[PDB]
């Protein structure tokens, strides 16, 4: 182990004894006096101080943000809407632990590190799709909806949220307001909407708007009913995206840890880094005053930015130690003061 020793070199040049300063108060006294014998008396060997127990942080408050993840009627898959968010903190902690969220899959960012980095802009994409194509929403694969309604780029970043709507979209009479396309001449580019509902033209025949035979209407209707089982239920899917390195950072979530008292801890009250014990005090600040000083410019009190409470700060216990020994002549017992 790494410690401090006092080696005794003889006239011959070979060490013949040693003492370990970390064993006993007597050994500490021997090291302090740099000798192997101590006479009767009281000696001040060192000084002790209680170590800090933990750390706390106190920062200001946050944004509220609810509306996009719970609305009345979500937009269709072929007419998905987008939202713009700026100059407000993104508290994703409330959504990470929420109960009825079923799907959380992404690749660009870590599932738990999304709040440790700061972004610039936030884009929210909201639509409703059947539960069969939840796997299909990932970029890379093709087919229905993924190529005809909503396509994602290969370098897409961000995490999407999907949840069931068993008791919020099912109707006994039947709902058909949710539409999707199965016939498109070209391929949809990533992050592109298709709103035109022109009838499909198949090679030939004069159905170029006549809407007759050998031509089908591309926008078909969904089949959304309590008699349906797993696989046909409508799933609400929201897609979050962002861009970086094109503007100053504006949107990102907040530490603001819990407050503890009556023990020497490390505190950070909007700065003012230090270590000490926190106790309630009767001192009365002015509204604009944050912290107070005693004689000789010593931090006596501080105001918690969260609850505006008045806290008295004093250093935790410290002091010197003294070892009472009757001398190595008689015995080796010691007492500590």
């Amino acid at each position: 182990q790494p410690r401090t020793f006092l080696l005794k070199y003889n006239e011959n040049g070979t060490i013949t004894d040693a003492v370990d300063c970390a064993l006993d108060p007597l050994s500490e006294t021997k090291c302090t006096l740099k000798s192997f014998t101590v006479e009767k008396g009281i000696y001040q060997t060192s000084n002790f101080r209680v170590q800090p127990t933990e750390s706390i942080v106190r920062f200001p408050n946050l944004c509220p943000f609810d509306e996009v993840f719970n609305a009345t009627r979500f937009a269709s898959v072929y007419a998905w809407n987008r939202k713009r968010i700026s100059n407000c903190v993104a508290d994703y902690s409330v959504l990470y632990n929420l109960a009825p969220f079923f799907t959380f899959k992404c690749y660009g960012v870590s599932p738990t590190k999304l709040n440790d980095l700061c972004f610039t802009n936030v884009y929210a994409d909201s639509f409703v799709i059947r539960g069969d194509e939840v796997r299909q929403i990932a970029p890379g694969q093709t087919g229905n909806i993924a190529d005809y309604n909503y396509k994602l780029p290969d370098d897409f970043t961000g995490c999407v949220i999907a949840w069931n709507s068993n008791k919020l979209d099912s109707k006994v009479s039947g709902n058909y307001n949710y539409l999707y396309r199965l016939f498109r001449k070209s391929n949809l580019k990533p992050f592109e909407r298709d709103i035109s509902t022109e009838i499909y033209q198949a090679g030939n025949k004069p159905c170029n708007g006549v809407a007759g035979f050998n031509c089908y209407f591309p926008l078909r209707s969904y089949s959304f009913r309590p008699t349906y089982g797993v696989g046909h239920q409508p799933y609400r899917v929201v897609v979050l995206s962002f861009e970086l390195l094109h503007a100053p950072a504006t949107v990102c979530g907040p530490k603001s840890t819990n407050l503890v008292k009556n023990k020497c801890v490390n505190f950070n009250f909007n700065g003012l880094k230090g270590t000490g014990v926190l106790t309630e005090s009767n001192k009365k600040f002015l509204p604009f005053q944050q912290f107070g000083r005693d004689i000789a410019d010593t931090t006596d009190a501080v105001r918690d930015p969260q609850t505006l409470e008045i806290l008295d700060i004093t250093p935790c216990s410290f002091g010197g130690v003294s070892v009472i020994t009757p001398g190595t002549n008689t015995s080796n017992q010691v007492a500590v003061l």
Partner: antibody, heavy 125, light 107 residues
């Protein structure tokens, strides 16, 4: 798919009221974003306002020079747009176009791209 | 408030550059529209660098900080029209439009 037709407009005394009708068909009308644009004769295009869609909240915006004095609305049942004008001025002599913001574009921005336009109508005050 | 030159004089077979100056062009990338004389404006250049379907591969757009540029390769006699740049402001989120520019043919 797409045809946009403009109705209304003409000669009217200052301070009167006039309503412009724009009808669109062939594309889906509740779930798209419209906008209004004007252009003085011999000058550039000038913004008028926006109506947006009810899927996401009504956030009908207006241009700064004509804020408050113009009324906009959307009626998805009859697929018609009504634009009501009040407290007309001598500088309102221009042509008005009803423009669909997005038909086929990569948006990645606010829902405003001005893909397809209309023929426009002439109004004089 | 976007600023554009009044008119551009480029001969046939030469690259035509159309500029649009604005303070907030770092974000809200500008969109370019072409308005024929006595005709409704049409979309030519939008998004990052692409164009709507049906537009011939002759117009390309680029941006650098607070400057937006339009490039024309192999100009014909039917391109004589007005070009407008449209951007967005951060606060009001308005289209504001631009002052436009005039392009002619030196044939």
């Amino acid at each position: 798919e797409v045809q946009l037709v403009e109705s209304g407009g003409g000669l009217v005394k200052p301070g009167g009221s006039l309503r412009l009708s724009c009808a669109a068909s062939g594309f889906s009308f509740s779930d798209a974003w419209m906008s209004w644009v004007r252009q003085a004769p011999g000058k550039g295009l000038e913004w008028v306002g926006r109506v947006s869609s009810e899927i996401g909240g009504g956030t009908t915006d207006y241009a700064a020079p004509v804020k408050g004095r113009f009324t906009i609305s959307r009626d998805d049942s009859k697929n018609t747009l009504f634009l009501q004008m009040s407290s007309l001025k001598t500088e309102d002599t221009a042509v008005y176009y009803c423009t669909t913001g997005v038909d086929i574009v990569v948006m990645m921005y606010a829902d405003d791209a001005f893909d397809i336009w209309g023929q426009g109508t002439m109004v004089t005050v | 408030e976007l600023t554009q030159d009044p008119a551009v004089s480029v001969a046939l077979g030469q690259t035509v550059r159309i500029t649009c100056q604005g303070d907030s062009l770092r974000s809200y990338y500008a969109s370019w529209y072409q308005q024929k004389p006595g005709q409704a404006p049409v979309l030519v250049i939008y998004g990052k660098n692409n164009r709507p379907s049906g537009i011939p591969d002759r117009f390309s757009g680029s941006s650098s900080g607070n400057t937006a540029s339009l490039t024309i390769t192999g100009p014909q006699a039917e391109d004589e029209a007005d070009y407008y740049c449209t951007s967005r402001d951060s606060s009001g989120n308005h289209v504001i439009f631009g002052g436009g520019t005039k392009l002619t043919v030196l044939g």
